[PDB]
Design a binder for this molecule. Structure first.
Ligand SMILES: CC(C)(C)c1ccc(N(C(=O)c2c[nH]cn2)[C@@H](C(=O)NC2CCCCC2)c2cccnc2)cc1
Ligand SMILES: CC(C)(C)c1ccc(N(C(=O)c2c[nH]cn2)[C@@H](C(=O)NC2CCCCC2)c2cccnc2)cc1
Lengths: 299, 298
């Protein structure tokens, strides 16, 4: 069946550093001569709302300690951009991979390298949900852990920097420009996220994977078009489906149109009746179209 | 809880592409030795493979071995069980501090899934009681390594991918050439035994549930280890190995292992429409160590 996996982490591990300001420690990402980290590393050890403009104005460069594998880098300057700091260091990372910065959209899959004290401990795949949170596995100190994707040509897309955990347990991050996904605050406030929607594009991909693994009991004989599904979706907690043309690869290899799968989703939403689909007892929005194509065909 | 893998960078630097004639798979380069599945020298044939004949007629110049497109000189080859040890003309300067370790059912480990000597994915898996794993491998994944990283940084190399069974289950060897479950590296049928639920992992899962405030399912009944183990063998579960390793979580929750053994018996047939941490049936994916590491970092 399908397994969530991560892309290999080697090229990203060499960019992880330990960033300390005063007593506070978290992780940063060292690319060229710049270390990016969450700005809340300079927050005071009080429990009130943080005034970041005052925190930044009173910042002292000598209070920073930035290190990679216990080797200390010299801090040259620091600027604040949204919810991140860009710490200029006197040494460029000789292991900087070919890379770009990319802002995720809901439904995008990516990889997390979970880090503590500047040392990677785990790697896993995740999906950005419609409420702009992820379900990671993080403990205290994971802030600044990077999320990434690796393109076919080897370019690393840096797309997520871990920021905070919500009361629900959901995880919030920024991109490398400092924009927080979902515009949550890097504050000790109570923040309740919107409810997540089922990612209809992923459920379609999952059903195509089921057809390709011989699992076909659930297949509706009839069809519903995109307009009818999207009307149903917004009344039943699903996203609108993108476009039928995106699935041309899987539609061609199975001979099943997206509209047949949309009809099947409407049936299966009410329940499976004790049966399962690839080990799942309800519809699965964990896997993207591209993940299904890669895991089935290597493309 | 999230199944995750330990970082792969130090193992990526050991993956090589191994080719014999037209056949390509992966190998693992440590020091001046590349280990790979011996079936790379199998003839293009539909018949059972005579490996002693294939080995005695092997010629070194039919091998090509490369790391990230850089080809290595091949100096000699020996056969050990279901693996070859290819001596190459230089040592891997990025060989990590490492040992070889043979897995036992119930051990978690990491797989670096590789094709043509290039890693494409990394994930955690459990060695099941039928000595197979549920990977996501497609053709060409043979030679993909399995590993664990010790706290001191030592890499344990524990799995080399060998074959896929008709069921889709995956079979590998250790680095001494012993195939887990003693499956054969042959085109024959081969059916693995029925998989058993890993009771040690299910107990850990139920403690994680308790620690997350999910306790609708908790039994006040107690079943002792001996009684549980007798029930387990008749109900598709492994024995529970021991109780004392759970004592930290038992103290935090106030719930004994024997209560969770009773709860497994209560929940074994299903949850009746409810869920535990989002699962609709008992989960044996997570070890005690994983639950303790992911919730407390220890
Ligand atoms: C300063 C500020 C913005 C209030 C803050 C304080 C602590 C952290 N958290 C650090 O772990 C951490 C480590 N170094 C610095 N912060 C944890 C975190 O989000 N707690 C609280 C944040 C707001 C109130 C509810 C929970 C954390 C992050 C990821 C996974 N699990 C725990 C994040 C932001
Ligand atoms: C020579 C021998 C022993 C018969 C053989 C042939 C092919 C392979 N398989 C290679 O993909 C592959 C790539 N390079 C060399 N073999 C695949 C594999 O197991 N097929 C068969 C093996 C026995 C008969 C039924 C299935 C494979 C697919 C997906 C994940 N894992 C392995 C393994 C062993």
């Amino acid at each position: 069946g399908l397994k969530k996996m991560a892309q290999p982490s080697g090229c990203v591990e060499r960019c992880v550093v330990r960033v300390c300001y005063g007593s506070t420690v978290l992780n940063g990402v060292w690319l060229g001569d710049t270390v990016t980290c969450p700005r809340h590393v300079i927050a005071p050890s009080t429990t009130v709302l943080i005034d970041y403009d005052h925190a930044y104005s009173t910042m002292r460069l000598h209070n920073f300690s930035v290190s990679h594998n216990g080797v200390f880098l010299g801090v040259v300057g620091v600027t604040m951009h949204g919810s991140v700091l860009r710490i200029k260091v006197s040494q460029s990372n000789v292991h900087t991979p070919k890379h770009v910065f990319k802002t995720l959209k809901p439904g995008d899959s990516f990889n997390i390298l979970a880090c503590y004290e500047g040392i990677a401990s785990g790697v896993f795949g995740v999906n950005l949900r419609t409420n702009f949170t992820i379900k990671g596995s993080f403990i205290n100190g994971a802030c600044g852990s990077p999320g990434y994707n690796v393109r076919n040509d080897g370019t690393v897309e840096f797309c997520y920097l871990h920021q905070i955990e919500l009361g629900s347990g959901a995880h919030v991050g920024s991109d490398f420009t400092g924009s927080v996904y979902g515009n949550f605050d890097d504050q000790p406030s109570l923040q309740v996220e919107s409810a997540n929607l089922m990612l209809s594009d992923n459920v379609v991909a999952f059903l195509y994977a089921a057809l390709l693994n011989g699992c076909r009991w659930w297949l509706c004989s009839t069809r519903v078009n995109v307009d009818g599904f999207n009307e149903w979706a917004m009344a039943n907690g699903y996203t609108s489906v993108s476009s039928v043309e995106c699935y041309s690869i899987l539609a061609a290899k199975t001979g099943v149109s997206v509209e047949q799968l949309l009809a099947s989703i409407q049936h299966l939403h009410e329940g499976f009746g004790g049966k399962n689909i690839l080990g799942y007892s309800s519809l699965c929005d964990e896997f993207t179209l591209a993940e299904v194509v890669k895991q089935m065909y290597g493309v």
